[PDB]
Amino acid sequence: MDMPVDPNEPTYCLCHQVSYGEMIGCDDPDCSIEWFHFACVGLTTKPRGKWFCPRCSQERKKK
Ligand SMILES: [Zn+2]
Ligand SMILES: [Zn+2]
């Protein structure tokens, strides 16, 4: 029993729920969502030490 309330806006992914499987997050420190599931992009694996969500990456579709 701990039930915190400090985040006035909990959950953020396209799944709107956290603490399930593994996690990522768009490396943009101004991302309005911050974290994303390894299946909110269908990653299944670690991409690199730099990633972007399917909205941050859409701004530079260059392959
Ligand atoms: Zn998700
Ligand atoms: Zn993002």
Side-chain angles (χ1 to χ4, degrees):
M1 293 183 180
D2 48 273
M3 300 182 180
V5 72
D6 306 87
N8 298 302
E9 202 292 283
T11 91
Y12 316 82
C13 41
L14 322 176
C15 291
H16 59 80
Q17 62 195 268
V18 212
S19 197
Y20 68 130
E22 70 291 281
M23 298 88 183
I24 196 156
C26 178
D27 290 73
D28 176 24
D30 193 60
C31 183
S32 296
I33 300 293
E34 121 74 52
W35 108 270
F36 293 81
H37 198 205
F38 251 53
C40 277
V41 60
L43 257 172
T44 315
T45 60
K46 186 189 297 83
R48 232 184 71 83
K50 198 77 173 71
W51 180 79
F52 300 94
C53 74
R55 298 182 182 171
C56 281
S57 187
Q58 297 297 337
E59 235 296 282
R60 286 92 216 291
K61 292 289 271 71
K62 47 51 182 291
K63 191 62 59 177

